[PDB]
Amino acid sequence: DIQMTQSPSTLSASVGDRVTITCRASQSISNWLAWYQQKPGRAPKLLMYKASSLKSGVPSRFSGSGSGTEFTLTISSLQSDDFATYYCQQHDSSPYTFGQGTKLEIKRTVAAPSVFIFPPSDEQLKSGTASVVCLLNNFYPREAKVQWKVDNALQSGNSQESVTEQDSKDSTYSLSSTLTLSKADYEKHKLYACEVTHQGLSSPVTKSFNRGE
Amino acid sequence: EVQLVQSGAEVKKPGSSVKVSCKASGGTFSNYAINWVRQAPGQGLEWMGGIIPIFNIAHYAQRFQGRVSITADESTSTAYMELSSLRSEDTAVFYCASPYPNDYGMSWYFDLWGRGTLVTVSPASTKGPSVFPLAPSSKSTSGGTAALGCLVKDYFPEPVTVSWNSGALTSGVHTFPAVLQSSGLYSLSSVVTVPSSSLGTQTYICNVNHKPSNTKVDKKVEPK
Numbered sequence: 543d544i545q546m547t548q549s550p551s552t553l554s555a556s557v558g559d560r561v562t563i564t565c566r567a568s569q570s571i572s573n574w575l576a577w578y579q580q581k582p583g584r585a586p587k588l589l590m591y592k593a594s595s596l597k598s599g600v601p602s603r604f605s606g607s608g609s610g611t612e613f614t615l616t617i618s619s620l621q622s623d624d625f626a627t628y629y630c631q632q633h634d635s636s637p638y639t640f641g642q643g644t645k646l647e648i649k650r651t652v653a654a655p656s657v658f659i660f661p662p663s664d665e666q667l668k669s670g671t672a673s674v675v676c677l678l679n680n681f682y683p684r685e686a687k688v689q690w691k692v693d694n695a696l697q698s699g700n701s702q703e704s705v706t707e708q709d710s711k712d713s714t715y716s717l718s719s720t721l722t723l724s725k726a727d728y729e730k731h732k733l734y735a736c737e738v739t740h741q742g743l744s745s746p747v748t749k750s751f752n753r754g755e
Numbered sequence: 756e757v758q759l760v761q762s763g764a765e766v767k768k769p770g771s772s773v774k775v776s777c778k779a780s781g782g783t784f785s786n787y788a789i790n791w792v793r794q795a796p797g798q799g800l801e802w803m804g805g806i807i808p809i810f811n812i813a814h815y816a817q818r819f820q821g822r823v824s825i826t827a828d829e830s831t832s833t834a835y836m837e838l839s840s841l842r843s844e845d846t847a848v849f850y851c852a853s854p855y856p857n858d859y860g861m862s863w864y865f866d867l868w869g870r871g872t873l874v875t876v877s878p879a880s881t882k883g884p885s886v887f888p889l890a891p892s893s894k895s896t897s898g899g900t901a902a903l904g905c906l907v908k909d910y911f912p913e914p915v916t917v918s919w920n921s922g923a924l925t926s927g928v929h930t931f932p933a934v935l936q937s938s939g940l941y942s943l944s945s946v947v948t949v950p951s952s953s954l955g956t957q958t959y960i961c962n963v964n965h966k967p968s969n970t971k972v973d974k975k976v977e978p979k
């Protein structure tokens with residue numbers, strides 16, 4: 543099949559900026575490349591086809607270039623409506639393949655996350671399960687690492703995290719990580735902690751509590 | 756009047772099959788190339804296959820061959836995508852898309868897109884959530900700011916709404932995207948940061964509504 547490679551995976555910019563996204567094909571596809579824009583929870587929208595043919599209705603600031611194996615999508619003067627994820631797709635032959643997308647976000651200064659840890663409530667313990675929650679609030683960039691530790695021992699496989707979309711007011715992100723343990727395991731250890739690693743922190747920040755205070 | 760109309764969202768048990776429809780009653784049906792593009796939560800777009808109506812010429816992606824059948828019905832100007840032997844990994848939004856219908860070449864990029872059909876694969880059935888407090892405390896008080904919240908656990912299916920103090924508190928509130936747990940039940944948390952000086956004088960309540968199960972819960976969150 544034809545493998546499509548998009549870069550960068552994430553692009554940070556500001557209104558007014560001129561930005562460029564690239565897409566490479568593992569083999570020549572002539573001018574048979576299309577570009578789509580997609581916003582959270584919405585269906586993709588066609589912007590460009592045949593490499594440089596602008597879809598009727600799409601703003602002039604969007605322009606495409608390329609042929610063969612190298613293509614680019616350019617936005618001459620980024621507007622707020624342009625922050626979204628973009629995908630390229632070769633329409634040369636089946637199977638039709640897509641690049642893995644480029645998320646165009648709003649750039650702001652690096653902000654360390656404010657970290658908070660929440661022990662499971664006594665009420666939930668009656669259900670036989672315990673949920674320990676770690677909140678990373680209002681940070682930037684989005685990349686962050688949360689590590690759970692029980693009695694100084696690293697956890698693995700028993701946690702899931704969720705992240706909000708970039709805040710429309712402060713351009714930050716927030717993330718919640720939840721460690722799930724049986725009531726038995728929970729009442730077997732004392733120290734519960736979530737260690738957070740982020741660009742804005744010179745060293746990992748650890749928030750914790752001892753079961754039963 | 757040229758649009759792709761998709762069937763509504765669905766909830767499916769593992770092992771079952773689902774058949775999503777996409778109606779394109781505008782223009783000539785044979786000039787469409789009804790393709791199906793899947794998008795799993797947090798993943799990119801994935802082509803599944805497509806078909807040219809009337810001519811009934813189909814093309815399939817290797818990964819779905821054997822499990823998917825794409826068809827078209829001229830009488831109703833509707834195309835279908837049937838995915839069988841559903842698994843948890845199959846959970847995703849399925850889009851139908853097609854080049855704009857020419858009127859009498861046909862390139863396979865997608866002018867038109869259906870709004871998408873979400874198919875959720877879970878062994879679970881409808882169920883209201885349990886709401887537990889995420890209480891403020893020492894390790895929950897960064898300087899003069901405190902964080903508190905509600906853990907809306909084990910409900911099905913989506914969606915669930917959350918408000919604070921019946922909508923009187925919206926500032927600093929973050930309600931995270933739900934996560935499908937290993938159990939096939941959803942879970943999500945809603946947090947809010949407030950002045951730590953207000954914990955002894957202000958009441959904090961999260962209002963959770965789960966229409967699917969007609970469940971309503973108001974949980975007052977207080978420091979432990």
Ligand SMILES: OC[C@H]1O[C@@](CO)(O[C@H]2O[C@H](CO)[C@@H](O)[C@H](O)[C@H]2O)[C@@H](O)[C@@H]1O
Pocket residue numbers: 543638639640641642795798799800801802816818
């Ligand atoms: O169908 C596999 C094929 O699809 C591509 C995109 O054209 O990747 C898609 O499918 C993967 C499997 O579900 C997802 O991980 C990915 O996000 C999605 O774009 C090709 O890379 C792959 O060969």
Ligand SMILES: OC[C@H]1O[C@@](CO)(O[C@H]2O[C@H](CO)[C@@H](O)[C@H](O)[C@H]2O)[C@@H](O)[C@@H]1O
Pocket residue numbers: 813815819820821822823824825
């Ligand atoms: O189009 C029929 C032709 O397609 C193949 C795969 O190349 O099977 C596909 O079509 C069937 C009929 O809709 C589906 O049952 C099957 O899952 C799908 O891959 C060939 O086997 C068949 O001759």
Ligand SMILES: OC[C@H]1O[C@@](CO)(O[C@H]2O[C@H](CO)[C@@H](O)[C@H](O)[C@H]2O)[C@@H](O)[C@@H]1O
Pocket residue numbers: 806811812813824825826827
């Ligand atoms: O994709 C539907 C389309 O495929 C054809 C062959 O090109 O028939 C295949 O699909 C049917 C639907 O599942 C099967 O009954 C048949 O055995 C299989 O070859 C067309 O006839 C049909 O319109």
Ligand SMILES: OC[C@H]1O[C@@](CO)(O[C@H]2O[C@H](CO)[C@@H](O)[C@H](O)[C@H]2O)[C@@H](O)[C@@H]1O
Pocket residue numbers: 574633634635860861862863
């Ligand atoms: O879009 C290029 C790609 O489309 C195919 C059909 O899948 O041919 C169509 O597009 C061409 C370019 O616009 C036309 O010349 C042709 O008539 C039309 O069917 C592929 O052959 C080609 O790689």
